[PDB]
Structure formats: structure tokens, C-alpha cells
Short mmCIF file of N, CA and C in Angstrom, two decimals:
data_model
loop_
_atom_site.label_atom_id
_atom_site.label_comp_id
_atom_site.label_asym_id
_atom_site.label_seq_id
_atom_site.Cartn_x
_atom_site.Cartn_y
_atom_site.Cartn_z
N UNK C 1 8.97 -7.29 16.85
CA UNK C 1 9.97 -7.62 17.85
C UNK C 1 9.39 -8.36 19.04
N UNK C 2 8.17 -7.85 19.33
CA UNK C 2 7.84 -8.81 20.53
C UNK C 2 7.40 -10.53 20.03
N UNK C 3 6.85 -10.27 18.74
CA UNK C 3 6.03 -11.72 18.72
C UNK C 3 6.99 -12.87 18.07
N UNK C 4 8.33 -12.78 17.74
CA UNK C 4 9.72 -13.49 18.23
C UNK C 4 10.41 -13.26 18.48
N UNK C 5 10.42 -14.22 19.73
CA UNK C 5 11.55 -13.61 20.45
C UNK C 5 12.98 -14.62 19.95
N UNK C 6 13.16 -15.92 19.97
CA UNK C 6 14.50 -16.70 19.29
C UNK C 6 14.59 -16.54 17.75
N UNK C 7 14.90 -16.17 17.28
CA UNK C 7 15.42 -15.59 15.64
C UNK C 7 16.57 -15.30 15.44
N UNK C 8 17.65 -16.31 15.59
CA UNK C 8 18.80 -16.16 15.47
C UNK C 8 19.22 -14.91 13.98
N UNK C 9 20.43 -14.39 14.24
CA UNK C 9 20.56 -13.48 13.11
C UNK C 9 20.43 -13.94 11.65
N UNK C 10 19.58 -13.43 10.80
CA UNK C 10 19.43 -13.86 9.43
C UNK C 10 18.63 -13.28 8.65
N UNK C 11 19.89 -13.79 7.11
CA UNK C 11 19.13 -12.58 5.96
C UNK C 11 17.63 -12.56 5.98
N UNK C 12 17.13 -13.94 6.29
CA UNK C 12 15.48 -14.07 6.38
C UNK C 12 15.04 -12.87 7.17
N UNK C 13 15.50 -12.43 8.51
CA UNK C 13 14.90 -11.66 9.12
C UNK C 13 15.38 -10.37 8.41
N UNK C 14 16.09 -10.12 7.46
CA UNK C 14 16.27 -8.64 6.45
C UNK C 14 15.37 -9.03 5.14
N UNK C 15 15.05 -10.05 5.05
CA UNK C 15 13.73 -10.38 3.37
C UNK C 15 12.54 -9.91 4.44
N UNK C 16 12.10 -10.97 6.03
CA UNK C 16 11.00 -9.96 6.68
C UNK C 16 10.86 -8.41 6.91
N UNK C 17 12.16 -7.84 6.88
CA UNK C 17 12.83 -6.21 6.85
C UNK C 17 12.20 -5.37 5.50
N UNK C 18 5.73 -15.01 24.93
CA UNK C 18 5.97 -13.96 25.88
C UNK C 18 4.89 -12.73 25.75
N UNK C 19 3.94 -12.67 26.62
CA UNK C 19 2.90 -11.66 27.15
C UNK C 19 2.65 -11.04 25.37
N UNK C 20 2.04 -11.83 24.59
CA UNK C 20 1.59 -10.90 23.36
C UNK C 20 0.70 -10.24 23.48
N UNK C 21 -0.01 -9.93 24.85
CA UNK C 21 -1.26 -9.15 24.89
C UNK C 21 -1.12 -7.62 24.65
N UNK C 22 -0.12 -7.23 24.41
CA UNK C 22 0.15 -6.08 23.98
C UNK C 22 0.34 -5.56 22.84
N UNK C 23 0.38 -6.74 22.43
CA UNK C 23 0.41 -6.48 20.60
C UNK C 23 -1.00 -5.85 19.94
N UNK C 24 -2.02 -6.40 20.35
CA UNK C 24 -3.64 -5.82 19.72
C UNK C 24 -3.37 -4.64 20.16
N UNK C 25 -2.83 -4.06 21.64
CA UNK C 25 -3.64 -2.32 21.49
C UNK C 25 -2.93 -1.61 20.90
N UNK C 26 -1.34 -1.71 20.90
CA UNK C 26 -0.85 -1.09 20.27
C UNK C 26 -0.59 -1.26 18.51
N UNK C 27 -1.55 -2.49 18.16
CA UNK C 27 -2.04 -1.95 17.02
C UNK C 27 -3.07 -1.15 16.51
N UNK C 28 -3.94 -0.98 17.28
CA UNK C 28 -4.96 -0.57 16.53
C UNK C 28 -4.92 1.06 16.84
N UNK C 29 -4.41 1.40 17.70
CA UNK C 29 -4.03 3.08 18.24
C UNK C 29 -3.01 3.67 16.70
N UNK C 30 -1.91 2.66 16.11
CA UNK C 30 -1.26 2.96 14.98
C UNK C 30 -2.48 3.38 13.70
N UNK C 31 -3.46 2.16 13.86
CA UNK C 31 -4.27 2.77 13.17
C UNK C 31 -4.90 4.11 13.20
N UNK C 32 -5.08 4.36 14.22
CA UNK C 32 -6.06 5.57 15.08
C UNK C 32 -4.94 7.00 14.72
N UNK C 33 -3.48 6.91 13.83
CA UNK C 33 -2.63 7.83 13.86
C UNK C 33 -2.18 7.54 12.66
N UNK C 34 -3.13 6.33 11.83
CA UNK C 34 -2.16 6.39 10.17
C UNK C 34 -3.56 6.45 9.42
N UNK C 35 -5.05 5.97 9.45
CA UNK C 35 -6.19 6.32 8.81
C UNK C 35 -7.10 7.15 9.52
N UNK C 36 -6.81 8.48 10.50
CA UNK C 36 -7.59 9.09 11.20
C UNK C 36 -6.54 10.39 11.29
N UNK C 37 -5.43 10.62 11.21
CA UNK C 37 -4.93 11.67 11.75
C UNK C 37 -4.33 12.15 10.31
N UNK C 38 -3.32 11.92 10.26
CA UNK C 38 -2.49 12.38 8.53
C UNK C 38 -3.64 12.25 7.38
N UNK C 39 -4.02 11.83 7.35
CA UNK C 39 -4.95 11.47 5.87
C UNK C 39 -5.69 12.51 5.84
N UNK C 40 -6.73 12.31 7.19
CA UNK C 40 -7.21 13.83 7.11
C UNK C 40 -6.39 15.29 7.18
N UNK C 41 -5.14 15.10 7.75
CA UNK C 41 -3.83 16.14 7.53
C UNK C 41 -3.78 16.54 5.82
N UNK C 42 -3.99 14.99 5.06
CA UNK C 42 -3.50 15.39 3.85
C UNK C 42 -4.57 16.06 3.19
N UNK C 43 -5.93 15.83 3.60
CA UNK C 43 -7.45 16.09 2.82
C UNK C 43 -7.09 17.86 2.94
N UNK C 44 -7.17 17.89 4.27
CA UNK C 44 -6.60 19.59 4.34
C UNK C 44 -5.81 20.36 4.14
N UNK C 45 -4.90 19.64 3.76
CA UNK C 45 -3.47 20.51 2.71
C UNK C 45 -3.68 20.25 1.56
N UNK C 46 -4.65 19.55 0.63
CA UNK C 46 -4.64 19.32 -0.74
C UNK C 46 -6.21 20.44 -1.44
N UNK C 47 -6.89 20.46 0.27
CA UNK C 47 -7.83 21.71 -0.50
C UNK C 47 -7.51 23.13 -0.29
N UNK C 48 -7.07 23.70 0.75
CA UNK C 48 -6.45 24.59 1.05
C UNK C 48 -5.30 25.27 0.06
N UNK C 49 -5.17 24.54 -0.92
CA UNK C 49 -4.20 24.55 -1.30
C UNK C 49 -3.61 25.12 -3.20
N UNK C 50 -5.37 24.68 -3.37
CA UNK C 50 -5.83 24.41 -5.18
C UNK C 50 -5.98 25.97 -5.40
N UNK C 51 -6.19 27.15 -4.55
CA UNK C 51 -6.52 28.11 -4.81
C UNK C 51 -5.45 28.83 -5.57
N UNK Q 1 2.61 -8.25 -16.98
CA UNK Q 1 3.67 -9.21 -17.79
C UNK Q 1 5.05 -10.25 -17.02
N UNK Q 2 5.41 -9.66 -15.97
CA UNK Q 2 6.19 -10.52 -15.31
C UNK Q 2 6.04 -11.94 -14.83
N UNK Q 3 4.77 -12.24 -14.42
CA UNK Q 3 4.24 -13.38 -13.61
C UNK Q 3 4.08 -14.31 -14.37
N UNK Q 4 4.00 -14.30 -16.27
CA UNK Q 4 3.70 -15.48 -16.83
C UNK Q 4 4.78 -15.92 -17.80
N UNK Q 5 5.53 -15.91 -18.05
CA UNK Q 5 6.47 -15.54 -19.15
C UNK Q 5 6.12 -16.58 -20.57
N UNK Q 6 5.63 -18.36 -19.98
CA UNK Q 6 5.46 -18.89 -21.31
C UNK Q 6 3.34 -18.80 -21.47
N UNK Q 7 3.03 -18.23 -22.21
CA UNK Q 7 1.86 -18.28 -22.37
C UNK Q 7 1.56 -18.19 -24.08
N UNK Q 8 1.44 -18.61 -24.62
CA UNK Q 8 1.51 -18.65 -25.58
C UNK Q 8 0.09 -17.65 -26.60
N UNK Q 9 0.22 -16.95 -27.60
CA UNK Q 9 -0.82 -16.08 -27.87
C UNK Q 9 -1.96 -16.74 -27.62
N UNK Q 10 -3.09 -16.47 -26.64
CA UNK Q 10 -4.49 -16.73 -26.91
C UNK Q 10 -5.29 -16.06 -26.60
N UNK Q 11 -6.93 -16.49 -27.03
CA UNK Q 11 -7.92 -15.40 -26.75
C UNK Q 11 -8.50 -15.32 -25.19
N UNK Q 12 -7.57 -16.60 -24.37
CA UNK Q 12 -7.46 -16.51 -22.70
C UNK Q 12 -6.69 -15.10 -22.37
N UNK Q 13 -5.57 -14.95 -23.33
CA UNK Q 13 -5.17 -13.78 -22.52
C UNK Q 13 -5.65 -12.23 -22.80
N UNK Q 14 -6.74 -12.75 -24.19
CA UNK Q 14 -7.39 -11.48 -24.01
C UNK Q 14 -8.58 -11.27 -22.68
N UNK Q 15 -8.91 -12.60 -22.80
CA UNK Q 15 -9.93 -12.65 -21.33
C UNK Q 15 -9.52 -11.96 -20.43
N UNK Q 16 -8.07 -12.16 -19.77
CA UNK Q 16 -7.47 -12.05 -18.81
C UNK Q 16 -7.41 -9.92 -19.04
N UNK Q 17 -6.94 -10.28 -19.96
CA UNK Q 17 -7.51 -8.46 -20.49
C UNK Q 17 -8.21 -7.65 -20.05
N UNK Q 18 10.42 -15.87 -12.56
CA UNK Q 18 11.72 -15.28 -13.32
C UNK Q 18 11.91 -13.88 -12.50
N UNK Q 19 12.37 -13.90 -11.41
CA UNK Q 19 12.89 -12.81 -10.64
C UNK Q 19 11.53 -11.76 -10.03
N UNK Q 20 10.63 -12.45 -9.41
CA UNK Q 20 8.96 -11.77 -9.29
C UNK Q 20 9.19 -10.90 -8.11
N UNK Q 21 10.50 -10.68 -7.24
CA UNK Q 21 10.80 -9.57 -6.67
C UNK Q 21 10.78 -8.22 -6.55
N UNK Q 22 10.62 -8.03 -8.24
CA UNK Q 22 10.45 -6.44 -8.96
C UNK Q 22 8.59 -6.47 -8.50
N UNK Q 23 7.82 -7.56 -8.43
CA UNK Q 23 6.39 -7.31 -8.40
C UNK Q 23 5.68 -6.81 -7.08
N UNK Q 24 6.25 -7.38 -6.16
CA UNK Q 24 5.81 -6.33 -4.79
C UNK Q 24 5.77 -4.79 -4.77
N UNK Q 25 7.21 -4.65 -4.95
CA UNK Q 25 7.58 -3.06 -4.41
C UNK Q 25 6.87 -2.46 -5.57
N UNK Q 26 6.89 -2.43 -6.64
CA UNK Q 26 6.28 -1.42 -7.62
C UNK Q 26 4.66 -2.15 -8.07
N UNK Q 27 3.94 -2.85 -7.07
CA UNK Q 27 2.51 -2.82 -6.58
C UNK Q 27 2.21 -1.63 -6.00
N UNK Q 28 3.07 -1.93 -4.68
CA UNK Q 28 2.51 -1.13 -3.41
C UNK Q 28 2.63 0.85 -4.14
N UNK Q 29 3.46 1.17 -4.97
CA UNK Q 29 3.66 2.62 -5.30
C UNK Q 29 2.45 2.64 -5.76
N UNK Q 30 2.28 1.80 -6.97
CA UNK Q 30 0.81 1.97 -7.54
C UNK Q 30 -0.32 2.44 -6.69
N UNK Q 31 -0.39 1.61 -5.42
CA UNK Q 31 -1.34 2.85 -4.57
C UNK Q 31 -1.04 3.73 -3.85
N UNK Q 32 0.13 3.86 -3.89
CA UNK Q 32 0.35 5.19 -3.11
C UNK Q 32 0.46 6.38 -4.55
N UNK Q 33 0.21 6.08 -5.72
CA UNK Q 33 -0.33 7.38 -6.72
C UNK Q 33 -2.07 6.50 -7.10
N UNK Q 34 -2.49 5.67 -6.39
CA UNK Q 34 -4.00 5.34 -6.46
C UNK Q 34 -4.53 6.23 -5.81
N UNK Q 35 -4.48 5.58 -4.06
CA UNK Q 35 -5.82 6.02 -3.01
C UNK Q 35 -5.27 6.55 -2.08
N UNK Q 36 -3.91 7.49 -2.51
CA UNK Q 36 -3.47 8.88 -2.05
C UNK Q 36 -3.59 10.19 -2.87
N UNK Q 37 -2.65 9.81 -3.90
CA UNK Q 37 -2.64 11.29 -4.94
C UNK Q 37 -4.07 11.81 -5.89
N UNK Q 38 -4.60 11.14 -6.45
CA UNK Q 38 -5.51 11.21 -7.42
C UNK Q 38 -7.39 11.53 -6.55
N UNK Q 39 -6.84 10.78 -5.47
CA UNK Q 39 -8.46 10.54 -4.94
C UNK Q 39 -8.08 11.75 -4.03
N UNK Q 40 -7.34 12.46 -3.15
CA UNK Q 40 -7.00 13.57 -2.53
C UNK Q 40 -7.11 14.79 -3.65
N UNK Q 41 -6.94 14.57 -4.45
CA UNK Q 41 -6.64 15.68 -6.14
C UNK Q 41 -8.16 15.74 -6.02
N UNK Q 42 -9.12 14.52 -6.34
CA UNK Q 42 -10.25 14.63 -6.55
C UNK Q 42 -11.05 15.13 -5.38
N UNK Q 43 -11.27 15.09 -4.42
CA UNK Q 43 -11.75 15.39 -3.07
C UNK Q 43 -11.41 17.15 -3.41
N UNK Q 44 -10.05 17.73 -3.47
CA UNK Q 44 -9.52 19.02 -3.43
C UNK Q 44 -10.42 19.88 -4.75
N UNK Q 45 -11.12 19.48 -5.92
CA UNK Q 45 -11.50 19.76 -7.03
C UNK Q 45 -13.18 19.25 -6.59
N UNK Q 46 -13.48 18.68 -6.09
CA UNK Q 46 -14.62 19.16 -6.21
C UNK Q 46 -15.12 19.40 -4.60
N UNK Q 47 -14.34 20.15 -4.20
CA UNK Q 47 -15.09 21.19 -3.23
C UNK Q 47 -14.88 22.20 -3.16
N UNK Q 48 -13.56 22.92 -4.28
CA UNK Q 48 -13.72 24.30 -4.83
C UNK Q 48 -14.33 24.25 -6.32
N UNK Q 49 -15.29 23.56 -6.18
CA UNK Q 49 -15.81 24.10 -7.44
C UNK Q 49 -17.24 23.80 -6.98
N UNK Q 50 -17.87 23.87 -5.73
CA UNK Q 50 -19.18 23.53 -5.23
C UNK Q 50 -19.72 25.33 -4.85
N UNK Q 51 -19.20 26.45 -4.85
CA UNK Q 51 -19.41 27.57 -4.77
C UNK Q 51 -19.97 27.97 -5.87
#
């Protein structure tokens, strides 16, 4: 949403379905909460678990 | 099998051994029962069996 902003309404933008400096941190923190937090969530509910 | 449809029998396609929309989405599942289910299964199996 931030990195266009004129995209008139269109099915294109449902097939994809200004200050970008905000885009890098709040990617890499997603990372920091999708290959660092759950995964290891899942490592520990899948051994915990076999017993 | 989707991606080639005229290929005619050869010993290229043993080497290797029209609607390509179906080929994304049932990629991406493939790893989510890859380098989620199986490798978490495996991680869970051999560290109760290291006792």
C-alpha cells in the first residue's frame, strides 16, 4: 500500500491480491516474527508433543 | 506436466527426469508439507530418540 500510491481500481490489483523509507524496517522486523518467533513456536509444539 | 503440453516422446525428457494458473498455488503447498511438516516431524524424532 505504501509503495503505490495512483492505482486506479483494478482486477490487476486483485491478480497482485512518497517517503518509502519505511518500507525496509518494517520489513525486516516481519521477518524477525515469521523465521524467528512461530517456527521456533512450531519446533516446540512438534517435540513436546511425539510423546 | 502442465508447462509443456507438445513435447513429443524423447530421451530429453527422460533427461529432464494452457491455463499455468493451477502452477503457482499448488507449488507454494508443496512447501508448506516440504520445509514445514516433514522437516519439523524430523527435528521432533530425532531428539526423542537421542536418550
Amino acid at each position: 500500500a505504501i509503495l503505490f500510491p495512483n492505482e486506479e481500481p483494478s482486477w490487476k490489483l486483485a491478480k497482485n491480491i512518497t517517503g518509502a523509507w519505511i518500507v525496509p524496517a518494517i520489513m525486516a522486523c516481519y521477518l524477525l516474527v515469521a523465521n524467528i518467533l512461530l517456527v521456533n513456536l512450531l519446533i516446540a509444539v512438534f517435540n513436546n508433543t511425539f510423546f
